[PDB]
């Protein structure tokens, strides 16, 4: 209880709880009468300015105990309101949250100011780290005297002061009994991590800088390293600085925004209703075909099913199999730019290099005097893509060491792995792509189908189809592709009878003249579509339920798969394609199963049809047919 404005400030927050605003909304049915018990309340400063700006911006310049007082006054309020939750005898800090915009600097720009402030960050989830508990206070006991004293301890990372330094008591009075009662002696949760600039604003003549973060109990580990984030907290700087040796920083006092979900969406059971209304429309698959790659011929009809992970199949204490799909094929010049349609279009999309050691999936766990006693640990580069897909470029240029190290969990669909320190295992059941090249460029068809590629013929069964990709034109199609490519060049740049300018309106405007660069809709509405039915967001809003629905098998599958596999192994190894009939095996069944499983999710028909049979075979024959 420092300078007595603190209590004035307490009651100024009590003065929040007068009428409709807080006596109506914000006090009562807010954490405890709703009983989820998040001691961290939701404040937004703007209402506080609308009562006491001395408490709005007196906070965002100094936060010594205005927070302490806020939590105090709140607990005393609910102590009046509701003694049932009066058993949590702690600070019960609060939010002071918001998507406000006072000062929202980068990790680069927490720059010699803002000390003693409550401000924003954005950046990358990185180094999501290990947990520990923390000390609050100790409920001791003396059987000699039947006396239960108590002792609370602090440190700067929680509030200002420090304990009057000493360890836990022993014979503290004169020699009587000091039985430390635990269970009554309590503990929060603790955590520590860092963030980087989602960097692409970085000047690569310069270094994208780093930050320092601390967290606490009900905030503990709320997303994964590999995601995008915005956060808003307060700031402190403890260490010595030549009174002894220089200075460092830390951040806290905060609530989160992860800004890449779907559950973030205000989801009723209506979005499903829009999907299922339009779901019946049959030739929508072709729309999704022309959807994700609108800027390029060419495939993606199939790539979808990679993009959907797969389907789970387990037996009664028997085995399990991995459900997912994997393919790839091509000389240079749309191959090397069909991979970043995922990095920045769909989630859980983490490309890899083509050149990678000790953490393409390894960790190597090398450690040097961690804050705790972690003798060995790091993480890797696969669980980032658990339950989805992956990109690479320069695959044939990859080492042939770790190719087999792929085959491990790829073909197993399991982890039973370790770096020899502790046996480790889990379920990461992932897919992947990469890129490709014939060792000499323009060759895959004249000389041979195989051996213009030159590698193990073992994988081709691990993958699904031998396939084709080439580039030539005859005398007639050249102007057709010319007009296609020139549609590419114009349906992208804006703005495309004696005098036709000087029209009633012009380019002269206030605030809707050119957003970035405008585009056309002419004759892509002869293609009767819309920018919302054919879009990003309604597309992705139909991601979740096809991943929740589970289209079981019909019955007419069996005779058809039989006849077609029969003819496949009969006469696919003839007619100019024999050396591209090498990998035929008893594996086209399970891929066909993943196929109809996926396609039966693209309209969510928990069922099976012969039309799906055509859909799932015709691509396979179209490989060469």
């Amino acid at each position: 209880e420092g300078e007595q404005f603190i209590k004035d400030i307490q009651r100024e927050y009590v003065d929040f709880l007068d009428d409709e605003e807080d006596q109506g909304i914000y006090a009562g049915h807010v954490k405890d009468m709703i009983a989820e018990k998040s001691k961290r309340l939701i404040v937004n400063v703007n209402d506080l300015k609308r009562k006491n700006p001395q408490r709005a911006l007196g906070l965002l310049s100094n936060a010594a105990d205005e927070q302490l007082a806020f939590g105090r006054a709140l607990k005393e309020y609910a102590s009046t309101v509701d003694p049932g939750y009066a058993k949590m005898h702690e600070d019960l800090f609060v939010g002071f949250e918001g998507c406000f915009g006072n000062r929202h600097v980068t990790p680069r720009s927490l720059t010699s100011i803002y000390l003693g402030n409550m401000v924003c960050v954005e950046g990358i989830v990185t180094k999501v780290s290990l947990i520990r508990p923390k000390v609050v206070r100790s409920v001791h006991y003396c059987p000699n005297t039947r006396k239960v004293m108590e002792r609370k301890y602090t440190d700067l990372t929680s509030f200002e002061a420090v304990p009057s330094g000493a360890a836990y008591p022993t014979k503290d009075e004169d020699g009587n009994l000091l039985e430390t009662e635990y269970g009554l002696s309590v503990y929060k949760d603790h955590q520590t991590l860092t963030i980087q600039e989602m960097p692409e604003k970085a000047p690569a003549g310069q270094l994208p800088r780093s930050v320092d973060i601390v967290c606490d109990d009900d905030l503990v580990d709320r997303c994964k390293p590999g995601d995008r984030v915005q956060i808003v907290g307060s700031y402190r700087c403890l260490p010595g600085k030549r009174g002894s040796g220089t200075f460092r920083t830390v951040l806290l006092a905060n609530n989160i925004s992860l800004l890449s979900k779907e559950s973030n969406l205000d989801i009723s059971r209506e979005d499903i209703m829009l999907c299922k209304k339009l779901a019946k429309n049959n030739d929508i698959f072709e729309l999704l075909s022309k959807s994700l790659a609108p800027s390029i011929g060419h495939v993606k009809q199939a790539i979808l099913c990679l993009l959907l992970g797969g389907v789970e199949k387990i037996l009664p204490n028997g085995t399990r199999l991995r459900g997912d799909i994997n393919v790839l094929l091509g000389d240079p010049s749309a191959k090397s730019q069909l991979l970043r349609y995922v990095l920045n279009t769909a989630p859980r999309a983490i490309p890899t290099t083509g050149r990678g050691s000790s953490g393409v999936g390894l960790t190597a766990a090398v450690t040097t005097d961690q804050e705790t006693g972690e003798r060995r640990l790091e993480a890797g580069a696969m669980v980032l893509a658990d339950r989805g897909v992956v990109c690479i470029d320069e695959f044939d240029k990859m080492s042939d060491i770790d190719r087999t190290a792929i085959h491990e969990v790829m073909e197993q669909g399991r982890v039973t792995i370790s770096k020899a320190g502790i046996h480790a295992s889990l379920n990461a059941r992932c897919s992947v792509l990469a890129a490709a090249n014939p060792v000499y460029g323009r060759y895959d068809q004249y000389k041979t189908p195989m051996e213009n590629i030159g590698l193990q013929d073992s994988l081709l069964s691990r993958f699904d189809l031998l396939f084709v990709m080439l580039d030539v034109i005859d005398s007639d199609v050249d102007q057709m592709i010319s007009d296609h490519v020139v549609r590419m060049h114009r349906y992208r740049n804006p703005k495309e009878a004696d005098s036709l300018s000087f029209v009633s309106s012009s380019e002269e405007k206030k605030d809707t003249e050119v957003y970035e660069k405008y585009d056309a809709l002419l004759h892509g509405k002869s293609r009767q579509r819309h920018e919302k039915i054919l879009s990003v967001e309604f597309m992705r809003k139909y991601i979740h339920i096809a991943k929740c629905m589970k289209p079981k098998l019909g019955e007419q599958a069996c005779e058809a798969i039989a006849n077609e596999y029969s003819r496949l192994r009969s006469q696919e190894a003839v007619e100019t394609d024999v050396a591209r009939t090498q990998p035929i095996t008893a594996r086209t069944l399970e891929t066909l199963i993943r196929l109809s499983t996926a396609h039966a999710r693209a309209r969510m028909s928990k069922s099976v049809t012969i039309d799906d049979a055509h859909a799932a075979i015709e691509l396979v024959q179209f490989a060469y047919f």
């Binding site: 000390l115 700087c237 600085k241 730019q337 290099t353 990678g356 000499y440 580039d471």
Partner: protein, 620 residues
């Protein structure tokens, strides 16, 4: 306060305080008050100063300023705030609170060299000129703070001893001794700290040796001031961090007597003007400059004049050079809401008989804003090291140093293929990938590249057919304009080359009668001109250009395929999407030069005739 000399007061008392109020010429500009106030208005908190004003004022300070500058240059700060806070008062009501400021120093005295920065030259102001390598991030530092134990803002001279007594002694006789200090950074401060760096010159004892270098320091406003790979002029000061001679001999087997460490802090860095020594990121350029720029852009005789800017001692290769500089400007990073960030920067190939001045030409293209040169056997896997302090795995990751600049190399042929592939790739997507240790940071940077080479068998391969490259056609892919170099004979050509270079090669010849040519002048100007013209205009096509260019590429591929058929076998280069995707950037470079945004197809018939060199080169 021993008021005899070297006193704390006399300087601040009136002298420094009144120097500026007194600093006068009519025109009523000539103070540092106006600059100070108008700097304050925009959050600057500094001002610029000379060191030969004291001669304008007096004859004593300077030979005392050099001696103990560490104090004088803070008396300056105090005098500054007290002489400026009076003006912070519009009346006494709008100094909501004062603030701290940083002074600058400058001169034109002379640059020194690192080989002489010695024990005499210590604690002493100076001037040098080096070059920059890299320097740290932005950590922290402050000046004072309070402690709960005493509740006093702890005031320091040096930028630690923390004595015994408690000061929570008002506990009765039960006091708290043995240093109980609770640092209260609610009450502390915060300034900056960045640790700049310095390499020595390229001509000043590196000869039978290697070049050393030095590390640096800053406080408040000289972070966000220097990006590395730059030429500086400097005023700093040479001082230490630790101290001691006697037999407290250091470490385990260290310090025979007394060796403490070097560094410098800056008091008034500035930059260089090697023509445009420092014109890379900031803008101290003035309206006269921009008028000059646009009025030369207004000049419709600028490009052919610029065909003669790199060859004032070189003859020939003019059709060759109509786009050797168009490389520099870059076109447009016309990105799109999907992935298709269609390729921004531009790339070139050249290869042929030696004796034709490839090396000197690329040295010059380095000369004329940002660039580097190695060639083979080795700028940039990218570099995942492990920090010898704390043993963490940081990424130095050096095409990053072309993050808008360009690159030139020969010696693609003469270096093996373990290191071509990451760079095979970067220059189609500009994203340096990483997946090696526990990091997936897909870095990126916009560099171009220039590619010289050497064909084994020379013009023999070039006479008959397919021995063009020794390595691959997938890097025959990525480049637009590709140039033979021959030295076909002619005696007229021979004699003209003869006297042309001798008149060059005679008595360090062309000082006076060189620049008297038309307008072919000042590569400095080109540094500035380029760093301007790329930094504004974002053009793209006009409608009439598109159809003819489209039909032209059509006929290009048809002729390549017919030569395929006119020989009954493939006689072509691959007619790629990349070829049009690059000639678009040649149009873009042209419009970047003249600054007209919308470019017409007559503007680009020049492009047609220049890549026609590549077409008719790989015509056979």
């Amino acid at each position: 306060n021993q008021q005899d000399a070297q006193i704390n007061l006399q300087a601040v008392k009136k002298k420094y305080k009144e120097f500026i109020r007194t600093f006068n010429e009519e025109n009523f500009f000539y103070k540092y008050r106006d600059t100070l106030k108008r700097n304050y208005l925009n959050g600057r908190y500094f001002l610029e100063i000379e060191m030969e004003d004291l001669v304008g004022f007096d004859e004593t300070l300077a030979d005392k300023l050099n001696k103990q500058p560490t104090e004088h240059l803070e008396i300056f700060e105090e005098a500054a705030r007290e002489v400026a806070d009076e003006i912070t008062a519009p009346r006494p009501e709008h100094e909501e609170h004062m603030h701290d400021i940083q002074i600058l120093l400058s001169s034109n005295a002379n640059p020194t060299n690192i080989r002489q920065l010695k024990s005499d030259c210590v604690s002493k102001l100076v001037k040098i000129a080096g070059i920059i390598v890299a320097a740290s991030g932005i950590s922290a530092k402050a000046t004072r703070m309070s402690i709960q134990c005493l509740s006093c803002s702890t005031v320091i001279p040096n930028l630690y001893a923390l004595p015994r007594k408690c000061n929570t002694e008002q506990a009765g006789r039960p006091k708290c001794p043995l240093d109980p200090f609770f640092i209260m950074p609610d009450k502390c401060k915060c300034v900056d700290f960045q640790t700049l760096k310095l390499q020595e010159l390229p001509d000043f004892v590196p000869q039978g040796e290697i070049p050393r270098h030095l590390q640096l320091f800053c406080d408040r406003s000289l972070c966000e001031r220097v990006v590395p790979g730059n030429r500086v002029l400097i005023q700093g000061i040479y001082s230490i961090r630790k101290v001691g001679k006697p037999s407290r001999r250091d470490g385990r087997e260290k310090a025979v007597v007394g060796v403490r460490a070097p560094y410098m802090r800056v008091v008034g860095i500035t930059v260089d003007s090697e023509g445009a020594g420092a014109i890379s990121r900031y803008s101290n350029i003035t309206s006269d400059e921009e008028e000059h720029f646009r009025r030369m852009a207004a000049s419709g005789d600028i490009y052919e004049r610029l065909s003669q800017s790199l060859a004032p001692s070189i003859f020939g290769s003019r059709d060759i050079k109509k786009a050797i500089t168009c490389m520099l400007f870059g076109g447009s990073r016309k990105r799109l809401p999907d992935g298709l960030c269609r390729r921004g920067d531009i790339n070139v190939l050249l290869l042929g008989d030696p004796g034709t001045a490839k090396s000197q030409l690329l040295k010059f293209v380095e000369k004329v804003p940002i660039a580097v040169y190695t060639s083979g056997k080795g700028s940039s896997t990218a570099s995942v090291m492990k920090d010898p302090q704390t043993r963490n795995f940081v990424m130095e990751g050096a095409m990053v140093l072309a993050d808008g600049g360009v690159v030139c190399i020969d010696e693609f042929d003469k270096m093996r293929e373990d290191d071509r592939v990451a760079i095979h790739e970067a220059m189609e997507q500009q994203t340096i990938s990483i997946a090696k240790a526990g990091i997936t940071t897909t870095l990126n940077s916009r560099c171009s590249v220039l590619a010289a080479a050497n064909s084994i068998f020379g013009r023999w391969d070039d006479t008959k057919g397919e021995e063009n490259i020794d390595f691959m056609p997938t890097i025959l892919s990525r480049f637009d304009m590709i140039f033979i170099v021959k030295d076909i004979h002619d005696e007229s050509r021979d004699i003209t080359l003869a006297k042309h270079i001798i008149n060059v090669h005679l008595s360090s010849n062309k000082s006076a009668p060189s620049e008297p040519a038309e307008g072919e002048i000042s590569l400095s100007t080109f540094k500035k001109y380029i760093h301007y013209c790329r930094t504004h205009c974002g053009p793209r096509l006009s409608e009439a250009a598109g159809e003819k260019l489209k039909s032209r590429y059509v006929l290009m591929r048809s002729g390549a395929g017919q030569q395929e058929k006119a020989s009954d076998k493939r006689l072509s280069i691959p007619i790629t999407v990349r070829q049009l995707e690059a000639v678009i950037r040649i149009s873009e470079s042209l419009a970047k030069i003249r600054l007209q945004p919308f470019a017409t197809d007559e503007h680009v018939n020049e492009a047609l005739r220049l890549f026609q060199v590549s077409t008719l080169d790989a015509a056979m």
